Amino acid sequence: IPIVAYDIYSRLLRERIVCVMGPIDDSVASLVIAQLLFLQSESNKKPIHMYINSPGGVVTAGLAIYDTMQYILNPICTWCVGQAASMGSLLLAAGTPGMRHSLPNSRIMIHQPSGGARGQATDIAIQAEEIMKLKKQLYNIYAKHTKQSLQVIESAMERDRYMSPMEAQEFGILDKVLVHP
Amino acid sequence: IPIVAYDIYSRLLRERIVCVMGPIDDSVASLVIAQLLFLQSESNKKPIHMYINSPGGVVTAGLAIYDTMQYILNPICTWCVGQAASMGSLLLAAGTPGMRHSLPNSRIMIHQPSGGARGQATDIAIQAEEIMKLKKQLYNIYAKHTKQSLQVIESAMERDRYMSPMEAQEFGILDKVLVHP
Amino acid sequence: IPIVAYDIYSRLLRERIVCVMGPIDDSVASLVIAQLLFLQSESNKKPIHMYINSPGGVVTAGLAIYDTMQYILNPICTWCVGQAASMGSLLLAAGTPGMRHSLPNSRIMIHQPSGGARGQATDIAIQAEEIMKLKKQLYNIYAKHTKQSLQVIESAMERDRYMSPMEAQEFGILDKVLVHP
Amino acid sequence: IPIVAYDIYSRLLRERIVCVMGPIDDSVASLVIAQLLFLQSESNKKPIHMYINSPGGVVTAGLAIYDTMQYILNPICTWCVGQAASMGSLLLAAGTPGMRHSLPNSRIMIHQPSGGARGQATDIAIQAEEIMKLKKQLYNIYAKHTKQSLQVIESAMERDRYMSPMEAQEFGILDKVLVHP
Amino acid sequence: IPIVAYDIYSRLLRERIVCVMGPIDDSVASLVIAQLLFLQSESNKKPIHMYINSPGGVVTAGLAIYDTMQYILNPICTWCVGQAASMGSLLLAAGTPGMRHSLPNSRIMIHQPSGGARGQATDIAIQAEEIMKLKKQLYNIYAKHTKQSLQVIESAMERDRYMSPMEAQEFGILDKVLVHP
Amino acid sequence: IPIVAYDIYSRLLRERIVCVMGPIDDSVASLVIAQLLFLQSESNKKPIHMYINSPGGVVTAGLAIYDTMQYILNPICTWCVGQAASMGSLLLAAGTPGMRHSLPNSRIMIHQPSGGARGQATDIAIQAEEIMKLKKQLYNIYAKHTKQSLQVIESAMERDRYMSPMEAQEFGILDKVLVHP
Amino acid sequence: IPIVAYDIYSRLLRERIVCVMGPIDDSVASLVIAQLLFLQSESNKKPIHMYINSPGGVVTAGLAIYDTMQYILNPICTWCVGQAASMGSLLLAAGTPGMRHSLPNSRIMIHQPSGGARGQATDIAIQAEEIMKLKKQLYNIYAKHTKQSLQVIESAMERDRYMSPMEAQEFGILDKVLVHP
Amino acid sequence: IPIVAYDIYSRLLRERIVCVMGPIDDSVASLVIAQLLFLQSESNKKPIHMYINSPGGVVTAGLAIYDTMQYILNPICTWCVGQAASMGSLLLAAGTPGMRHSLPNSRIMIHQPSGGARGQATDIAIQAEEIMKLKKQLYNIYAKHTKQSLQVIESAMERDRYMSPMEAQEFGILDKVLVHP
Amino acid sequence: IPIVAYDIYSRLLRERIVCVMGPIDDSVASLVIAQLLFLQSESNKKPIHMYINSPGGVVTAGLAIYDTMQYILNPICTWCVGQAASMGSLLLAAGTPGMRHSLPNSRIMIHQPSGGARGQATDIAIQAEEIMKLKKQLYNIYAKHTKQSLQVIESAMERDRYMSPMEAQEFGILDKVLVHP
Ligand SMILES: *[B]([O])([O])[C]([C][C]([C])[C])[N]C(=O)[C]([C]C1=[C][C]=[C][C]=[C]1)[N]C(=O)C1=[C]N=[C][C]=N1
Ligand SMILES: *[B]([O])([O])[C]([C][C]([C])[C])[N]C(=O)[C]([C]C1=[C][C]=[C][C]=[C]1)[N]C(=O)C1=[C]N=[C][C]=N1
Ligand SMILES: *[B]([O])([O])[C]([C][C]([C])[C])[N]C(=O)[C]([C]C1=[C][C]=[C][C]=[C]1)[N]C(=O)C1=[C]N=[C][C]=N1
Ligand SMILES: *[B]([O])([O])[C]([C][C]([C])[C])[N]C(=O)[C]([C]C1=[C][C]=[C][C]=[C]1)[N]C(=O)C1=[C]N=[C][C]=N1
Ligand SMILES: *[B]([O])([O])[C]([C][C]([C])[C])[N]C(=O)[C]([C]C1=[C][C]=[C][C]=[C]1)[N]C(=O)C1=[C]N=[C][C]=N1
Ligand SMILES: *[B]([O])([O])[C]([C][C]([C])[C])[N]C(=O)[C]([C]C1=[C][C]=[C][C]=[C]1)[N]C(=O)C1=[C]N=[C][C]=N1
Ligand SMILES: *[B]([O])([O])[C]([C][C]([C])[C])[N]C(=O)[C]([C]C1=[C][C]=[C][C]=[C]1)[N]C(=O)C1=[C]N=[C][C]=N1
Ligand SMILES: *[B]([O])([O])[C]([C][C]([C])[C])[N]C(=O)[C]([C]C1=[C][C]=[C][C]=[C]1)[N]C(=O)C1=[C]N=[C][C]=N1
Ligand SMILES: *[B]([O])([O])[C]([C][C]([C])[C])[N]C(=O)[C]([C]C1=[C][C]=[C][C]=[C]1)[N]C(=O)C1=[C]N=[C][C]=N1
């Protein structure tokens, strides 16, 4: 990591740029929330830019970031660079309307959640009930921000669904596919 | 394994004695069914003795043995030696009425089934539905042979429930606790 | 393995009983085919009994057994004991019409094939084309023996589909659910 | 970890924000207590904000934090971000009354403690007695802060019990579910 | 294993000699019970000789053997060769009165049972209750055959208690310490 | 492996049936050659039946079998059961003209050889020259028995090429696709 | 570890607070002694606060800390936070009389030392003699600071003995159980 | 890493030199994009120099860098040092026309993408469709910057194709092969 | 690493001394090139000293360094300390004529390149062609700087060829063997 607020990510932080890179877990989520709360405290008016290059991650860690993005007053511009899959595509869609961007060659992928269950039949019934609830929760989120109906969402996310940026724009995950500024 | 129809288990087979020992898996189940079908073909009238010392095992392997025991015409005497837990307690209860035996110091344990699930939320919902069906199936079997109501069965099997032979007799899992012949 | 044509499976072979137990691989398939060809050479008229307790296995190994069952002149009675999943459910359905049996508590499961692919994009395109062809092949087989239409087959096998013996009979996988002979 | 009191968590510390993130162990507990004692020494009047995103952890480490929260004079606002399970849900409930918050999409889970025992029968009897005492201890804590009766607590925590924020508010684990400030 | 009913242990079986050697598990217990039932069927009058050299083993496997020894009509002579610890000392004490032997340099050891427990606090409470019951069970057995009071048994077995053959005879575990026949 | 010249493969050997099953290595090749030489010595006139279910194997081991098949005077009938890939498809094609068979659902696959090289640049140049020679060798063999030109062979084997039995017959790998005898 | 004498533990050191956290080994002991000697050199009059959250540790490492606590002139206040087991409970008891504190929900555990021995019988006799001496040493220490007789100490520490803070106060391990300052 | 903006890579950053070294993954891509955005913000007019020594890497990580290079207004000079294979050769070709350089002894390699697929046949069909789309995408990129037709691109990239710098210049991957400045 | 531009290698960098130590890989090559470009930018006239102690390394990483040495305008003095084998001997020979040095007891070794190949026969033919080209490339480099004919080079490098400094000077790898300055 190179040095220029000294190391390169801190130097970008002064620009109000937050990088969401790689798998999203609790540690990653913790960091991003900290930066979003810091950037809100520096000012509640200036936009924040979130650059997303992620294969996905943990649902509750992603929902933590998503709630933080909704809760802070700042407008948030989201940028898909390279890929946005699972949680990364959800966070991309959660950007302020008219402020959700992709580069020309990024890939978007959406799908239903996956997990596991163990134990006695009663413990398994509880855990299956919980992942079903989370599935419905996530589908509501995607319906809200993309404006697609629940039926469309359910049909699209049953299996892995890869999108080009133009397809994603048509779907409602993002607003602009920009080549040059 | 010692030699006396030559090795000691084959020598017992001539007595119409089948040994169900240790964990019950497909291989074990395969063997026991083979011996039961052989002993039926040698005669459909003479009783068979099943000696059970088992910690439990795979549900479908156990249900395979259980169905074989019901299907053949021979009366089957069951003997609890040492322990009968999970499937072993179910097979013990499945013996011909009035022919289900324990030695004085054997332990019986009954409980609900356990397992796992993996994959997408839809795959998990299917697998949880399947272990729930198996649970209801097994509870019906225990209710049939012990004469307890379903409510009693459900209450008893929610957690691990260890029994002395006298308790098991009271429950209806077995008929006789014998010290000497 | 006990001794009574001496060991218990050889002793059953004299009864024209073939055991298909556990995962189906090339070795298992090799054995079963050998026994079927032997039993045909001993006589082409007498029925053969195939007892199936299997979680599934390799497609080509299973198709090897399936072709052997069709090719020999003998009628083949199939028996589901414990479970028939994947290839095991297909082999169960491949028994001579009116001769396909389940015990009361067996579970049947049907689903589409699964696999993997690796290499260059051209190698992956070839391997995906091959598993697609195998899927269509298998669906034709199930349609033939169950008399369901292809559409029904495709709908049923998209995900894991567990069946009781009565459901399986309704589906057309088997003819008789027998409690006692 | 980015740099802006220089690194991002230290920069939040100046805001009197303590982050309780991931599994709670002795090291984590040590850190949180240190920060709480530091923030009390900086002033005993100003509130402290505890942001909780935790799957749970060690009972004594969690009880250490819980006692520290009760002992210091400062009011403590608790924030559920993402999830609060086991100890995390207990620490969330331990916040100053009227000051316990969740974001809209957080999950709360409550359950009884789990552990192990080994050794001679006398050693096992001691260890089982100890985890039983800890269970009663924890149930008293939850009853105190949620105002539910012990009977309700015992019924709810026998198995894993997941809650939405509104359900948690109804239960008494938290006071406010906030979308925007 | 050398050959002389051909291999050396089978050749001893014709003498009505059963060898209980090494750790006692289900497999070992299965074998010994099979031999005891065979030797009873050959005649119910002739004594059986059990030669014991064991460090101990599984409680239910040992109790299986112990019940078999009580159930068969034959008198059983027990021989301590080398050591009898845990279950081995219990099986030695279970021989027919006046027929329990040690060689001059054998060691006897008695102690309480050991085990483990895991899971939720409710599961641990059940498992601890079960090992306590087994402890009381075993102490009753030792009191019966040695004629010591329960209080003496409890005091002696709290910790590992090694005995010479003469001490064991004084205790009541055995009757004769023989140098030459 | 079951017993009926006693075990099932030996019992088939008396029928002049050789089984080529699974991966082809030196050991497998050794066995098959031994059986072919034995069956020739029993008579040079009677046909031999080779049943092939193989994923492939070592080139020199396969070429060993192939040369043996050409060298012995007996006509050889080849049977594809399940699959014939790599060497297995070559051995299938090497059967006596008009005597090469597939079952209806077998898969045939043909491809070029694969391997590795290591060492100094001079050692690598030698090893690459050797696998190139082997490639040309094998393509000549396939051209001979299928009657396709070298150009066709080279085009077909550049990548993995799966065939149905009818396609294989069209290609010239086999003569008859038989459903029933 | 966060930064505010800069990192949080150094910042507490300026308050004369020493943290004894987790397992006590030579490294941990080295650190604590260094801090105690530093804090004595800064002044011999001002009290030191030792916060203890420990599962236990090495006897000689703990005795090193204990001797340092006795040797320095400063009064030492000890605080049980979360747990004090083994050496942690001993160090808690070693605080200046009237200055030994617990929070309400801490657990105290006392027990005898444990270890191992290896080698020749002479080497084992030496090592057993050494752990016996250490046991007597430790029991004298506990008797001194708790004012219990040796007999009481020996009885209490034979097995693991868990205490609530009030029980510990009654025992004499600590003076005050404080809820709020 | 040596120190002279202090460490050697930061010291080069002040020269507007970005190093793309070794395998290209998300972390590497993240860093390079950060530096490119920083260098654009320092001025949009001054050229950037990208030094490439890479064996290749992840497609989406590489496409992320490639899109960033196109999006920023600065001209970008690319330098092949040592090797440019896979993504490294693509990034080399993506430099500003007339500004793409190689040293005399660098090797360029181009080839099609590689990957894997797993799961059900439907999941495999989706994943194969996705790598096919990515292949077409990449071939369009190479056609754009090298000015070769798609047919030429497809023919060249079917297998690994190594190039000297002069060959690469002829192909259109680069403009200048420089010995001295 | 000790501190005196602060750590010892940075302190030498101010002397225009670059250390090439141990195996040469991409990371090592990256560092050396960075330092050479930095030292050129500080001035294009002042010589650079390269101290070489290397067992060898990756060809393209070494060729990267070699091209950098040729490209920069500065004269480069090379010093063999301890050993120069493979790439290390090539880099030693690449120093400015009259400026290539060895200490008295250094060992030089030259040999041909080594590697590996895998895959289909076509992939292996490509990879063997590539290592052959690299071999010819390297032999041209050695011929250029040592002034030996290609025939001499080929003969010398077929096997490992160790040289004393005087032998190396005779060969033309270096100019001066210095005892004292
Ligand atoms: B995605 O592919 O990243 C996807 C999120 C999408 C639905 C918005 N991720 C998941 O579904 C994860 C997968 C995972 C499981 C286990 C560890 C790490 C990642 N599922 C969960 O996180 C999860 C959480 N609670 C219950 C079940 N599954
Ligand atoms: B018992 O304790 O043996 C119990 C049977 C009882 C309910 C009559 N066994 C099980 O429940 C087993 C546990 C197991 C799981 C996995 C491997 C081996 C054993 N459960 C199952 O076999 C099972 C089968 N299908 C679905 C889910 N679980
Ligand atoms: B079943 O669940 O057993 C199922 C067969 C069903 C469709 C009649 N099995 C498979 O689909 C197997 C799974 C498997 C993969 C790899 C090793 C072992 C088992 N699939 C294949 O065998 C296969 C074969 N060729 C290509 C792809 N997949
Ligand atoms: B929770 O799920 O985090 C839960 C706490 C809840 C009851 C408030 N955690 C536990 O119960 C832990 C689980 C655990 C065991 C072992 C290592 C780490 C975590 N139990 C204990 O910590 C514990 C402590 N002492 C005795 C027994 N169990
Ligand atoms: B002895 O030392 O062999 C002793 C038996 C004695 C009391 C007559 N053995 C045990 O107590 C065994 C130890 C053991 C545990 C686990 C695996 C193997 C051996 N205890 C048990 O077998 C047991 C059984 N059920 C519950 C708890 N412990
Ligand atoms: B096939 O897929 O089985 C194929 C044979 C076909 C061309 C008739 N097999 C091979 O090409 C084998 C693959 C292999 C390599 C290493 C171990 C085992 C199998 N190739 C060789 O055996 C081989 C032999 N000598 C040199 C190079 N490769
Ligand atoms: B306690 O549980 O931490 C306890 C101390 C108590 C008696 C005040 N600890 C010990 O007894 C330790 C256990 C241990 C053994 C080996 C490594 C680490 C910890 N015993 C000893 O340290 C020890 C030292 N010398 C001889 C024997 N045992
Ligand atoms: B090259 O050799 O680096 C090449 C890129 C070229 C086509 C411009 N790389 C790939 O094709 C990579 C290989 C790889 C696979 C898995 C992990 C790391 C690298 N392929 C992919 O990244 C990929 C991505 N999505 C789907 C399939 N393959
Ligand atoms: B030397 O011994 O360091 C020698 C270089 C000499 C010819 C100037 N090294 C090599 O030949 C290396 C060996 C190596 C292989 C694999 C990893 C690391 C080192 N060969 C190569 O680097 C290479 C590169 N491309 C193709 C084949 N071999």
Curated annotation (Swiss-Prot), chains A, B, C, D, E, F, G, H, I:
> Which organs or tissues contain this protein?
Detected in liver (at protein level). Predominantly expressed in skeletal muscle. Intermediate levels in heart, liver and pancreas. Low in brain, placenta, lung and kidney.
Q: Which UniProt keywords apply?
A: Acetylation, Deafness, Disease variant, Hydrolase, Mitochondrion, Protease, Serine protease, Transit peptide
User: Which Gene Ontology molecular-function terms are recorded?
Assistant: ATP-dependent peptidase activity; ATPase binding; endopeptidase activity; identical protein binding; peptidase activity; serine-type endopeptidase activity
Task: Give the UniProt subcellular location, in the record's own words.
Answer: Mitochondrion matrix
Residues annotated as carrying N6-succinyllysine in the record are 133
- Kindly list the positions at which N6-acetyllysine occurs in this protein: 144
Could you tell me the EC number(s) of this protein? Answer: 3.4.21.92
Single GO cellular component term: mitochondrial matrix
**Keyword DNA-binding: yes or no?**
no
Per the record, the major location class is: mitochondrion
Q: Where is the active site?
A: 86, 111
GO BP annotations, alphabetical order: membrane protein proteolysis; mitochondrial protein catabolic process; protein quality control for misfolded or incompletely synthesized proteins; proteolysis; proteolysis involved in protein catabolic process
Q: Which family is annotated?
A: Belongs to the peptidase S14 family.
Binding partners and assembly: Fourteen CLPP subunits assemble into 2 heptameric rings which stack back to back to give a disk-like structure with a central cavity. Component of the ClpXP complex formed by the assembly of two CLPP heptameric rings with two CLPX hexameric rings, giving rise to a symmetrical structure with two central CLPP rings flanked by a CLPX ring at either end of the complex.
In the record, what disease is this protein associated with? Perrault syndrome 3: An autosomal recessive, sex-influenced disorder characterized by sensorineural deafness in both males and females, and ovarian dysgenesis in females. Affected females have primary amenorrhea, streak gonads, and infertility, whereas affected males show normal pubertal development and are fertile. A spectrum of additional clinical features, including cerebellar ataxia, learning disability, and peripheral neuropathy, have been described in some PRLTS3 affected individuals.
Q: What does this protein do?
A: Protease component of the ClpXP complex that cleaves peptides and various proteins in an ATP-dependent process. Has low peptidase activity in the absence of CLPX. The ClpXP complex can degrade CSN1S1, CSN2 and CSN3, as well as synthetic peptides (in vitro) and may be responsible for a fairly general and central housekeeping function rather than for the degradation of specific substrates. Cleaves PINK1 in the mitochondrion.
Name recorded for this polypeptide: ATP-dependent Clp protease proteolytic subunit, mitochondrial
Entire-sequence positions represented here = 59 to 248 of 277
